[PDB]
Amino acid sequence: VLGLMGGLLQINPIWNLGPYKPSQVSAGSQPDFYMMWTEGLARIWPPWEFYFWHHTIPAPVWVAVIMGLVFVLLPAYPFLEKRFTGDYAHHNLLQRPRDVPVRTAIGAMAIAFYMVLTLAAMNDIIALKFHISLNATTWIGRIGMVILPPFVYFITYRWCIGLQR
C-alpha cells in the first residue's frame, strides 16, 4: 500500500516553492496534519496580553501552557481514573466501549475538540473552496471550541445507554 500511494500520489513538491527568503510568503502555510491542532489553537485563541512594569507577556505563551497541559494530561490519565473511580484490581478482560458510558463520552469529547482544532487550521482552504467568510470561520471555530465538546458528551452518553438497552 505504501509503495502504491508513494508512486501514484504527489506529496511535498518543493520545486514549485522556492528557497526560503525572509521577505516573501504564500497563502497556504499549514504544517502536516499532526501539528495542525497546534496551529489552529494559535489561530483561534483571543489576543490577551499583559503589560506590567518594564515587561511584556505576549499571546503565544497561552499556546505554550495549553500544549504543555495537554502533554501532561495525556500520560497521567490512568492514575486520575483510578483515583476517581476507586478501583485498584487486576484486569485481563477488556471492556466493550458501550459498557463504560462516562469514559466513552470523555473520549468522544476529546476527539471532537481535536477535530475542531484541526479544522480551524485550514481556514483559508475551507473559506476559498466552500464559499464562506474568513472571519466567519474564525468565530465558528472560536465558539465551537466551547459548545461542541459538551454536546458530543451528552449525545455519546445517551447513545451508549441506548445500545445497552
Partner 1 sequence: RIKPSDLGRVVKRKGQESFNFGEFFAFTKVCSHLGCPSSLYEQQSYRILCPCHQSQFDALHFAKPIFGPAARALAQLPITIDTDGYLVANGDFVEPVGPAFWERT
Partner 2 sequence: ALLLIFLFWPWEFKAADGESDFIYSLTTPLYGLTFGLSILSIAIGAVLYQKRF
Partner 3 sequence: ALFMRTELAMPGLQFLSNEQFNQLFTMHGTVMLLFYATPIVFGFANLVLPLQIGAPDVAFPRLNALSFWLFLFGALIAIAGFITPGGAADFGWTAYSPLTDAIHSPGAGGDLWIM
Ligand X SMILES: CC(C)=CCC/C(C)=C/CC/C(C)=C\CC/C(C)=C/CC/C(C)=C/CC/C(C)=C/CC/C(C)=C/CC/C(C)=C/CC/C(C)=C/CC1=C(C)C(=O)c2ccccc2C1=O
Ligand Y SMILES: CCc1nc2ccc(Cl)cn2c1C(=O)NCc1ccc(N2CCC(c3ccc(OC(F)(F)F)cc3)CC2)cc1
Give residues in contact with partner 2 (CB under 8 A). 1-8
From the list partner 1, partner 3, partner 2, none, which binds 133 (C-beta under 5 to 8 Å, kind-based)?
partner 3
Q: Does 147 bind partner 3 (CB under 8 A)?
A: no
Q: Which long-range contacts (CB under 8 A, 24 or more apart) does 132-136 make?
A: none
73 binds ligand Y (CB under 6 A): no
Angle, CA of 137, 41 and 140, to the nearest 5°:
20
Binder of residue 11, out of ligand Y, partner 1, partner 2, none (CB less than 5 to 8 A by kind): none
Do 117 and 35 form a contact (C-beta atoms < 8 A)?
no
Q: Taking the C-alpha atoms of 151, 153, 154 and 157 in order, what is their torsion angle to the nearest 10 degrees?
A: 160
Between residues 42 and 110, which has the closer beta carbon with respect to partner 1? 42
Cα–Cα–Cα angle for 110, 114, 117, rounded to 5 degrees: 140
Binder of partner 3 out of 35, 136, 146, 161 (CB under 8 A): 136
Q: Residue 92 binds what, of partner 3, ligand Y, ligand X, none (CB under 5 to 8 Å, by partner type)?
A: none
Beta bridge partners of 51: none
Contact residue for ligand X among 42, 63, 107, 127 (CB under 6 A): 107
Hey, which residues does 57 pair with through a beta bridge? 50
Q: Given the rule CB under 6 A, which residues bind ligand X? A: 33, 37, 70, 73-74, 77, 106-107, 110-111, 113-114, 118, 122, 125-126, 129-130
